[PDB]
Each structure stands twice: as structure tokens, then as C-alpha cells.
Ligand binder design. Structure first.
Ligand SMILES: [Ca+2]
Lengths: 359, 95, 192, 192, 337, 48, 42, 48
């Protein structure tokens, strides 16, 4: 049975008290503050249950970067660059490298015709074409491996104006509402989406044959902003800019992780052991300081050891960011057993048969 | 054929040299600390350290375990009274 | 406690991994096929020439002139889903680990002799163990699926002696990778 | 797996008095577990939970808090212990208002690692290489203005309240359960 | 795994510039660390194969400044994942003498102050002058909270009356309770003599000692060091150390006339032979290079064990910050020449 | 690891119906759960 | 000490699958067909 | 304790993986690429 009585009062009394800093000043490197606490009549208090509450703003600099690896086209091989084109003399001609993923139906005088509308009363399904904005996407393609190699198909690469970058670790901010990257230039307003359609036919049939040249490929040239905020080039062919044929081989690797933060136990957040900004606690009756300290009372390390000494340490506590510095032991000392290099592995063709031979 | 090389590593700790007569943690205060001879006069101290070489400038951190204490009393309402003490060195004033 | 280790007394009891002696096979997660790609990404390409469409004041839609005005005719372009190769990953690791760490210690009576080599007549010679060939198919990945079970072939074998015992590895590495090694040990009196 | 979803609770006897009575709580009228935007800022451990509730729970489970807080002893912290089931989490995402080029982008129009993975289903890859558009930047020299929000996670334990003078566990039979002013007559109960 | 974890954290005297890539001249900026390159094949799978062994250089690098630090990951993730965040934190009271002091009724003035420098307030995994990379901070407000206990007025008054009498005051002490002095070791130095003028020696207990890196120790006294540039863990205020192997031998003397252990107590009546080099008296043990005397000394001083043989200490009595938990001997084989 | 261990337990309302295959009608049948598919884009490593 | 003892028969059902992955040509390419032949017009 | 098992009363308490409840994100460490090679090694070739 619990104790009967004479433990708790019955006149009203707060269970928690909050106090405002009467005095606050700030300098170049530090700021000082001072409060007037009051322990009231017939009220008694233990100091251990007092702390400070601090709120504010911070920026961890630009270099902060928690994750390793990178998150912009990670799976792609480190070599292959994006579709592009560039200039080259024999007094100046264009060379183009590109891949067109989607097969349509039939080309037109202005733009590839994807599907047809629904025929109606005198409404026989007007030939519905693409939509520069984005109609051609960057992921569609023939579903299965037995592709029929349709006679028409498109893709897209941007102008030679934008500098060339490797596909791995490449990002561009959307500008079109419905997911289409492209620089919107001003023309009495942002209305202009300067996209230029280009047509392409087989080289030999474009040289000379029994017919007028016949395009089978449609390309959409456009322009976007580019950046690789998490990766840097690893090998540079030349030391110059202005993308050329060689620079098609440029490759990059991600930047190292960065893990800045608040050191344990907010160590250093408050001054101690330094006769410069010596803290004060006293009775308001007179200016008579109680807290006197020296230059050598290394309270930090002592308090750390003591906090260890009274219980377990492994568990972390989020009340005051209580968590010790850790490191895997294998990193410091390796145990190189080797590996298990038994029956090897293989990769195979997507259809499962390399090449048959009509018989 | 080849040779042999043995090393070790012991981090996240600091070594100790107790001031006993037997290097034993018998109590919170050494018997020697209570022996008269090292208690009734003054004596010079000298130490020698020899360590493996290293390039960049470094530091040697020395801890002297001692008694550091404080007594606090309140005579009346709204008064706090404090007296600290470190064992062997100095503080404040003695007039 | 016996778990913790002490050097000077060679304090380590031989321990065998639990799951090695008793397998709990569950398959893997194999819903995404893994793809490897050409070093340049797009494998093959054909040669193409730029073509600037005709003026086409009538019935000249695809009709087009050569755009050689500003373009080399040696363009490289690919069409279709790009070439690549397929592989599974986790199933293969699982199979490799199974084969090594269980198969390599089957009872000898089930592994036959090799061919075009020399294997010592003496059963216990190291070369003898290193030379017999044992068919992996017996312990293939799909063995007693969804079964917390022990291989009765492996049962009466002594699982303490193995190549995954931390105690033996510790007492080995204590004396380094080598062949001509000195040692500076001490030993305790053990009579009660 | 739901206990984190509660918003607030209120008590009364005979439509008369808020249960804490004397001003023992910063909000005597109603209890308060988690808050929306809080000018006072009573949330601790970086979570969004009002501190007084943390104090109440700590006392009511382990009689700890009147003289500060610290990790409870191992044996007292059982398996269904409050403290074993506390996870404060937070994140920061991209504001729409303070930023200009923000664009709401449904899944259909989104591309990352295009040309190396299936489209809306795990089949063979398709597409051409292209810089992505979904994963917004949150680091480096070109990040975007942001807004931060946070929540907590708890589960596999129970919210509890003792009918004590100061919430401690001072014996099996409580004290207020004895008090003849509130333990010798009849009253009704209402909660919200 | 090996290449990443080890190779990306090696000493800088094995790193050269990359061709055709602009790289800042500063030896501290993040880009300088990232862009500097180092050869993979240096540490590939053919290294010491077969050895619970650690690489030579790594013995003198600061391991805790890293990215495997689960604790550092915990703290930083707590914050989140952004270049800008506000915060809502608490801070406990450090000082020992007033940590658990029992207060009494009155009206008391309290006052303190805090640093604003990024370097001390912050602690990065890599290590770079934040003041160059422009990490920002600002304190909006500060409130002070405290808790009470709804006692009984009669009981509280009786307790106060029994407390205020000067027969029963409060007493406190620090948990470490040691004097701390630091001395400099110049470049490639090996020998340090230290002196203390004649003074009383009443009530002394013994010594502790370690070694630190001059670059990673802020100075006392000053409210801010302009010439301070490092933002990893701070051993003088964290408890992490690594230079223990560097200690070789130490000797004591009073009045330049007597060795402290005095009469015959150890193998060496002259100094603490911590780790002997390759020599043939058979004086080390446990396959390490540490002499029996020092090992026994530490064992006794931590557990009063050694006059009754040896064994493993008890787990509960032992701790994370113990001698025995963090001691590893190793050995390896290398090409004769 | 992510795709399986997280994606394949999302609430039904975010996963559509398959095409050109048979499928049951009761929303609790085993085959209902198995034959439902969902885009692998929502929990790829390019997230949080 | 006391406790009941029950012995009997149970059928788990045709919707049971204790293991992840699949157990028939595990390493088979996710799309590769096998030896087959099929009809077609002229 | 309830963290161990016992056949006698079908005794084992269900649980869940920690990381599934709240995932983490650190990317990975992938500086060194990985390569497949032709079974012979040189594949292509040219009479000489
Ligand atoms: Ca050709």
C-alpha cells in the first residue's frame, strides 16, 4: 500500500517553470546571457533537472554531402556519354552521335505521326503527331527483344552549344510542367520552346540510288541547363573546353561523403575552464560569485568519463545528442581471409541464343 | 625465406602509474600519500620520456591524479557559500 | 565466460557457424534482372547522312535534298532498345557459398577420381583431399527448399574441423602468414 | 502499430473539473501529445512531442525525471518498454512557395536512369541516356530553398496514465484511490 | 570494399595532382581532398594476404574522423539531409560543483555565455576549415526551463530547517580530479626531459599520460583562435587516442638522486621498459612486444589482479574505457632481403 | 533489396490492375495480391 | 505440470509458398524461351 | 527474457527487421567499376 499522506500539497503550484533571459548581449564570436531565477517560499529545488533551451538556424556549408555513391543515372556505364553533336573542320561541319529509342508509324512533312484520332462523322481520325514539348520521351522503346525494326523512329539530342557531359551523374531541372527538360527562352515572353526538328536517312541512299532520298529518322534538337553537383571528371582527354570528337570519352567519379554535425554532448557549446568568460551564479542579495574555476579543470573529459562510469554507453539518447564516436574494427585491422572463387558466373544473351544460322 | 615482425595497438585509453608501494588499488587514498616522508618537506621532481619518432610537431599530455573537492553551505535565506580546494598547488589568496 | 578471447593463454574454443551446420534456405530476391552494357553503351550503329527537306510547294513531303551544306555524311546512329546482356546476382552468390562451404567436405565415398592427373595412393595425404572432384549438383541451390534441416550425409562428419572456425583462425593468424616462424610462448600449469 | 496517431485527450468528472485540477500542467484544460506549429516550442528530443507528456511517461514507467533524465537501467527496461520504442525522425524537402522554378511532376513524366531499366514495370530496358529530373538537389553550390518537417514513431507499447498525486509508483494500491474525499462517494465520468 | 574504405584515407604524401583538372592550392579545402588521387593497385587483394594485421601508415591516422562512424551518421542524419536547417535543441549543465547541488529558497542570479565559432561548435567527418566553406549559424532565442516536486509545505519547511544548519552542508568532488599539463615535442624529436621544482608532495596519487597532435588541439584562455583550422574529433575533449604505441621508455627521479621504484622491484630497477625492441632476453609476453613488468603494472592498477596469476576481468567491473578491452597484439611475415 | 522488401507491401490503392491477363475479383484472394503489379519507381534509391 | 496433448492432421492449402525466389532453372535468363516450334500461315 | 525461442509452447515472439521500419540512405562505394570478359579473352581478332 502507498504512503497515506503528507507527501503532496493541495494549494495550487506549477510542476514546471520557464524563465526569460533578462540580459542578452552578443559579440564577434560569442554571446552572453543572464537570468534571475527565483526559488519560492516553501518550494525546494534540485539543480540536476535544469538545462537550457536553444533554437536557431544553421547551414552546413555547400560541402555537406551525407550519401556515398551518387543519385543521377547511377546504373549507366561510366563511359558512354549522352547523345550530342559538335563542330569539326574538313570550313566547318557537324558530327552527330545519337540513339533513337522509339519506333513510330510513318514520317510526315513536319513531324512523326504517333497515332490517329477516332474516326467520326466526316472526322476520320486526323493524323496525330508528336509534341515537341515532350512527345518524344527518354525511356520508351520496343517492349520485347524480338524487335521488328520498324521503318520509322525517333529520339532526341540537344545542340552543340551546351557543353558535353557524361551520362553518369548528370541532372537537369525540369522546366515544362509535365516533365520535359528544356530551356525556355524569352520571345515577348517565355512562350518560346525553341526545338528544331531534323530529318535523317541512310547514308548510301542519301548519296545516290534509284530513288529520291528517303528519311527514316526524326530528331528533336533542343537545349537545357546542365550540372553534375555530385560528380567530378576522373580523366580529361584535353585541357580545353569546347567539346570536340575526343571529348566523347570523358568520364567522372562521385565526390566523397561529408558528415558534418554537432559534436557529442554539445561539447564546446558552453565556455568552461577559461578565465575569460567565467560564468556566474550567486544570490541576488549581493554580487558574490559562487562559481570559481581555474584554467586546468578539464571538466569536459572528466564529465565524459563519469557519464561512462555509471552505466552502459552503446545506446544513444536523443534528449541531448548522446552518442559516442564509433568505428568498425575491420577498417583499422583487416582479416583478409580471401574469397570464395568457386564455380564461376556468367552473362548470357537476352534471348538465350547467341546467333542461330538459318538451315 | 623471410623475417618476422610483431606489433600491437591499444587505443581509447590512457596508461596509469599509481603512487602506491605495490601498484595496487587498495583505496581511494594511497598509503604512501599518508607516509610522513613524502608529506613533511619539499622535494624536486624529474622525469625522462623516450618515444618513437614522428614528423609533425606533437604534444605530451600529463595528468596528476589528485583530490579536488568543494564544500558548500547556506547560512540563511538566499545565500550560497562555497569553498573549493585542490590538493597540492594553489588557489585564490592566503593574505 | 568463454566467448571473449585472451592471447597469452590461447584462450579460444573452436566454434562452428550455426547456419553452416544447419541450413535455412529461403531463395533470394530476384524480381529485377541485372544488366551489363557495352563500354560505350550503345553497341552497334549504322552510317547516316543529314537530309534537308525540299521546299515542297507540292507533293514533296519526304522529298528532300542533301544537307551536305553543314553536315558530314559519316553519322553514326543506333535504333531500337539498346543491346545489353543479362545476369542474375543473388542466386549466384547463394549457390557459390553453398557449394564451397558445404560441398567441399562431403563424405569421401561419394566423390570419384579425377582424370589426366596424379593423385596420391595414400588416403590421408593433403594432395588426396585437394584432388578428388565432387559433383556440385548434389547440393545445388534448390536443395530442400523451405526446410530448416541438416544434411544427413554431413551429419556424422565432425563439423568442428572446418575453414570457418574463428578460434582456429585466431590461433593461426596469431603466428602470421608464413612457413618458417619463431615463437615466444608461455604455458600454465594445469594439474588441479 | 498506431499509438503515435493520437492527437489529444481530455478528462472530467461530473462535468465539473479538469482532472489535474491545480495548475500542474502547462495546459490544464486538455492534455497535449504532439502539436502543429508551436510558438512556445515545447517539443523535445527533436521530435514534435510536448515535453510534459515525456515527463509524465518517464515518471509513470520508471519514476525518473524529477531529478533529471538519463538512460534507464537495463533490467527495468523490459521488452515492452516505452523507451525501447521511441524513434524521432525528421527530414527537409523542397518548398513550392519560396522557390520559383518548382514544378509539380506526376510519375508518368519522370525519368531517371532512362535507357537502363524498365518503364513502370520490371522488363528489359529501353530509352536513350539523359540527365534525370526527379531527385531534386539538396547539397552543394546550387541547392534549393527548403522546408523541414518532423514526426516521431512508436509502436508495440501502450499509452498509460496513473491516478497518482505526482504520477510516481509509490506502491501497488495508489493514494488518491484511498482519499475519502474522492474515495467515499459517487461520481460520473466523461472523456474526449 | 577494401579500396574505398582504406585507400580514400591515406596520408597525403602518397597523393599527386590529376592532369588537366584545376585543383586549389589550399591543403585543407574539401575540393583539395576530393580531387587529389591515389593509385588503387597500391592496396589490392594481394596484401599481407593471410594476416590479422594492420597497414603500417594507418597506425598514425585519426581513425574516428571517417564515414563508418555509426554515431556520426546517427547525429548528422538526425538533423536530416540538407544545406540549411533550423534546430530546437536542449543543453545540460556541465560543471560538477553545481551539477547536483541542492537549492534552497531565495532569489538567485544566473549567467553564462556560449561560443559562436563554427569550428568548435561543429565537427566534420572529413576535416576542413569551415570558415572557408561558409557554414552559417544564428541563435534566435533562449528560454530556461526547470522542474519541481509537489511536496508538502510542512515537510518542505522541516527539511529546509534541517538543511540550513551549518552542521550538515553539501560536499562535492570532480570524477577525474587531476592536474593537466601539456608539453611540446618538436619535429622528429625523440627525447623529452621534464622538471618540477622542489615542492611538497602531500596527498598525491599517480600519473596518467598520452600523446596528441599539435594540429588538433585548440588553445586555452582565448575566447577564439584565429589560427585554428581543423574540424574533426578533438581528442583533448573526446577521449579518443591512438599514439600509445609511440611510448617507449620513462624514468622517474626525486632530487636527481633516487629512482622512484627504489630497491629491487622490476626487471629494470631504472625505468619502465614499456616495449622493448628486438632483443634477446625474453622479456615480453603474450606474443606482443610489451615487457612483462609494464603489463603486470597495468593489470594490477586496473583490477588488483596479478599476484594470483592471470585471467579475464569481469565484464560488469570492466568498461568501454578500459585497458583490456582495447588491446590488440598482431604479428606478420615479410620478405627477407 | 529496396524494391522487394518495401515496394511489394504498399497499400492497394496505389497499385493498378494488370493488362491482358486473368485476375480475380475479391480484393483479399492470394491471386489478387500476387497478380497486382506496381511501378518500381516509387522506392528506388533515388529517394529520401 | 499439467498440459493438454493434441495430435491431428492439417492441410496448409494450395496457396502456400515458404521461400522467396524460384526453384526451377534459377539462373535462366528472365526472357529466354526454350526449344520449341510453332505453326504459321503460308 | 522473450528474445530466445522454445519449441515446447511454440514459443517465439514475432518481430521485424530494424531497417525495414525506417530505411537509411548512404548510396554505396563504387569507384572501381566491374567488368565481364569473353570466355577466351580477346574475342575479336584478325588473320596475320
Ligand atoms: Ca555497317
Amino acid at each position: 500500500v502507498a504512503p497515506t499522506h503528507d507527501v503532496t500539497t493541495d494549494r495550487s503550484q506549477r510542476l514546471t517553470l520557464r524563465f526569460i533571459p533578462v540580459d542578452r548581449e552578443d559579440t564577434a564570436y560569442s554571446y552572453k546571457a543572464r537570468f534571475t531565477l527565483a526559488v519560492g517560499d516553501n518550494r525546494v529545488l534540485d539543480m540536476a533537472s535544469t538545462y537550457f533551451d536553444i533554437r536557431g538556424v544553421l547551414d552546413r556549408g555547400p560541402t555537406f554531402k551525407p550519401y556515398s555513391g551518387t543519385a543521377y543515372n547511377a546504373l549507366a556505364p561510366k563511359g558512354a556519354p549522352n547523345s550530342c553533336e559538335w563542330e569539326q573542320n574538313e570550313a566547318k561541319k557537324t558530327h552527330v552521335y545519337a540513339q533513337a529509342p522509339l519506333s513510330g508509324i510513318k514520317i510526315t512533312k513536319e513531324g512523326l505521326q504517333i497515332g490517329t484520332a477516332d474516326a467520326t462523322v466526316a472526322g476520320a481520325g486526323k493524323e496525330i503527331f508528336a509534341d515537341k514539348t515532350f512527345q518524344p520521351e527518354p525511356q520508351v522503346g520496343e517492349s520485347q527483344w524480338n524487335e521488328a525494326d520498324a521503318t520509322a523512329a525517333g529520339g532526341r539530342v540537344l545542340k552543340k552549344t551546351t557543353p558535353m557531359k557524361p551520362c553518369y551523374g548528370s541532372y537537369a531541372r525540369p522546366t515544362n510542367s509535365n516533365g520535359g527538360q528544356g530551356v525556355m527562352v524569352e520571345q515577348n515572353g517565355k512562350l518560346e520552346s525553341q526545338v528544331e526538328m531534323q530529318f535523317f536517312s541512310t547514308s548510301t541512299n542519301a548519296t545516290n540510288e534509284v530513288n529520291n532520298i528517303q528519311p527514316t529518322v526524326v530528331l528533336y534538337s533542343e537545349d537545357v541547363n546542365m550540372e553534375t553537383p555530385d560528380t567530378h571528371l576522373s580523366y580529361k582527354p584535353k585541357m580545353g573546353d569546347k567539346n570536340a570528337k575526343v571529348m566523347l570519352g570523358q568520364q567522372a567519379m562521385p565526390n566523397r561523403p561529408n558528415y558534418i554535425a554537432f559534436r557529442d554532448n554539445f561539447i564546446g557549446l558552453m565556455y568552461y575552464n577559461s578565465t575569460g568568460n567565467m560564468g556566474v551564479l550567486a544570490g541576488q542579495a549581493s554580487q558574490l560569485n559562487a562559481v570559481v574555476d581555474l584554467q586546468d579543470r578539464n571538466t569536459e573529459l572528466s564529465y565524459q568519463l563519469l557519464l561512462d562510469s555509471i552505466g552502459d554507453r552503446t545506446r544513444y539518447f536523443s534528449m541531448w545528442n548522446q552518442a559516442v564516436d564509433s568505428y568498425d574494427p575491420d577498417v583499422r585491422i583487416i582479416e583478409n581471409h580471401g574469397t570464395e572463387d568457386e564455380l564461376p558466373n556468367y552473362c548470357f544473351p537476352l534471348g538465350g541464343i547467341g546467333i542461330t544460322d538459318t538451315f | 625465406d623471410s623475417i618476422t615482425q610483431k606489433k600491437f595497438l591499444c587505443d581509447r585509453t590512457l596508461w596509469r602509474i599509481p603512487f602506491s608501494s605495490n601498484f595496487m588499488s587498495m583505496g581511494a587514498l594511497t598509503d604512501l600519500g599518508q607516509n610522513l616522508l613524502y608529506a613533511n618537506s619539499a622535494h624536486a621532481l624529474d622525469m625522462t620520456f623516450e618515444v618513437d619518432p614522428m614528423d609533425e610537431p606533437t604534444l605530451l599530455y600529463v595528468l596528476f591524479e589528485v583530490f579536488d573537492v568543494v564544500r558548500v553551505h547556506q547560512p540563511h535565506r538566499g545565500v550560497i557559500e562555497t569553498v573549493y580546494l585542490r590538493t597540492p598547488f594553489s588557489a585564490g589568496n592566503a593574505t | 565466460d568463454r566467448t571473449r578471447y585472451f592471447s597469452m593463454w590461447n584462450q579460444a574454443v573452436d566454434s562452428y557457424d550455426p547456419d553452416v551446420r544447419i541450413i535455412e534456405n529461403h531463395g533470394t530476391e530476384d524480381e529485377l534482372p541485372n544488366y551489363c552494357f557495352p563500354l560505350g553503351g550503345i553497341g552497334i550503329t549504322d552510317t547516316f547522312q543529314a537530309v534537308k527537306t525540299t521546299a515542297a510547294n507540292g507533293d514533296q513531303g519526304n522529298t528532300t535534298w542533301q544537307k551536305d551544306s553543314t553536315f558530314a555524311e559519316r553519322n553514326e546512329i543506333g535504333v531500337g532498345n539498346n543491346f545489353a546482356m543479362e545476369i542474375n546476382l543473388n542466386a549466384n552468390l547463394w549457390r557459390n557459398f553453398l557449394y564451397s562451404n558445404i560441398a567441399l567436405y562431403l563424405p569421401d565415398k561419394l566423390k570419384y577420381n579425377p582424370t589426366n592427373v596424379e593423385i596420391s595412393d595414400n588416403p590421408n595425404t593433403y594432395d588426396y583431399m585437394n584432388k578428388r572432384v565432387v559433383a556440385p549438383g548434389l547440393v545445388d541451390c534448390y536443395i530442400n527448399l523451405g526446410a530448416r534441416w541438416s544434411l544427413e550425409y554431413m551429419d556424422n562428419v565432425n563439423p568442428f574441423n572446418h575453414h570457418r572456425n574463428a578460434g582456429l583462425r585466431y590461433r593461426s593468424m596469431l603466428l602470421g602468414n608464413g612457413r618458417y616462424v619463431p615463437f615466444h610462448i608461455q604455458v600454465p600449469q594445469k594439474f588441479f | 502499430y498506431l499509438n503515435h496517431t493520437f492527437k489529444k485527450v481530455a478528462i472530467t468528472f461530473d462535468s465539473s473539473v479538469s482532472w489535474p485540477g491545480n495548475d500542474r500542467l502547462l495546459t490544464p484544460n486538455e492534455f497535449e501529445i504532439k502539436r502543429s506549429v508551436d510558438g512556445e516550442g515545447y517539443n523535445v528530443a527533436q521530435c514534435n512531442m510536448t515535453k510534459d507528456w515525456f515527463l509524465v511517461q518517464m515518471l509513470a514507467n520508471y519514476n525518473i525525471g524529477y531529478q533529471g533524465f538519463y538512460i534507464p537501467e537495463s533490467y527495468k527496461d523490459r521488452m515492452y518498454s516505452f523507451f525501447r520504442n521511441f524513434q524521432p525522425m525528421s527530414r527537409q524537402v523542397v518548398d513550392d512557395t519560396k522557390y520559383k522554378d518548382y514544378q509539380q511532376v506526376g510519375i508518368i513524366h519522370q525519368h531517371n536512369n532512362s535507357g537502363f531499366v524498365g518503364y513502370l514495370a520490371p522488363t528489359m530496358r529501353e530509352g536513350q541516356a539523359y540527365p534525370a529530373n526527379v531527385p531534386y538537389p539538396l547539397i552543394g553550390k546550387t541547392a534549393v530553398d527548403s522546408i523541414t518537417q518532423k514526426k516521431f514513431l512508436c509502436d508495440r507499447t501502450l499509452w498509460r496514465i496513473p491516478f497518482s498525486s505526482n504520477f510516481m509508483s509509490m506502491g501497488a494500491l495508489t493514494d488518491l484511490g484511498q482519499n475519502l474525499l474522492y474515495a467515499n462517494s459517487a461520481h460520473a465520468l466523461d472523456m474526449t | 570494399f577494401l579500396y574505398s574504405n582504406i585507400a580514400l584515407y591515406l596520408p597525403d604524401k602518397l597523393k599527386y595532382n590529376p592532369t588537366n583538372v584545376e585543383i586549389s592550392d589550399n591543403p585543407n579545402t574539401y575540393d583539395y581532398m576530393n580531387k587529389r588521387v591515389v593509385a588503387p593497385g597500391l592496396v589490392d587483394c594481394y596484401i599481407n594476404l593471410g594476416a590479422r594485421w594492420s597497414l603500417e601508415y594507418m597506425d598514425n591516422v585519426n581513425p574516428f574522423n571517417h564515414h563508418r562512424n555509426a554515431g556520426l551518421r546517427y547525429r548528422s542524419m538526425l538533423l536530416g539531409n540538407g544545406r540549411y536547417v533550423p534546430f530546437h535543441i536542449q543543453v545540460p549543465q556541465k560543471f560538477f560543483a553545481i551539477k547536483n547541488l541542492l537549492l534552497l529558497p531565495g532569489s538567485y542570479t544566473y549567467e553564462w555565455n556560449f561560443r559562436k565559432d563554427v569550428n568548435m561548435v561543429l565537427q566534420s567527418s572529413l576535416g576542413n576549415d569551415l570558415r572557408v566553406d561558409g557554414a552559417s549559424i544564428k541563435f534566435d532565442s533562449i528560454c530556461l526551463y526547470a522542474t519541481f516536486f509537489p511536496m508538502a509545505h510542512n515537510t518542505a519547511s522541516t527539511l529546509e530547517a534541517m538543511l540550513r544548519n551549518d552542521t550538515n552542508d553539501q560536499s562535492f568532488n570532480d570524477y577525474l580530479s587531476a592536474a593537466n599539463m601539456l608539453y611540446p615535442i618538436p619535429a622528429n624529436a625523440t627525447n623529452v626531459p621534464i622538471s618540477i621544482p622542489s615542492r611538497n608532495w602531500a596527498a598525491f596519487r599517480g600519473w596518467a599520460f598520452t600523446r596528441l597532435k599539435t594540429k588538433e588541439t585548440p588553445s586555452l584562455g582565448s575566447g577564439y583562435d584565429p589560427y585554428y583550422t581543423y574540424s574533426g574529433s578533438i581528442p583533448y575533449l573526446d577521449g579518443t587516442f591512438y599514439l600509445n604505441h609511440t611510448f617507449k621508455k620513462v624514468a622517474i627521479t626525486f632530487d636527481s638522486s633516487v629512482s622512484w621504484p627504489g630497491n629491487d622491484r622490476l626487471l629494470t630497477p631504472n625505468e619502465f621498459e614499456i616495449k622493448r625492441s628486438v632483443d634477446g632476453e625474453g622479456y615480453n609476453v603474450a606474443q606482443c612486444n610489451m615487457t612483462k613488468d609494464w603489463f603486470l603494472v597495468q593489470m594490477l592498477a586496473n583490477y588488483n589482479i596479478g599476484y594470483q596469476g592471470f585471467y579475464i576481468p569481469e565484464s560488469y567491473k570492466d568498461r568501454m574505457y578500459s585497458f583490456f578491452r582495447n588491446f590488440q597484439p598482431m604479428s606478420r611475415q615479410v620478405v627477407d632481403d
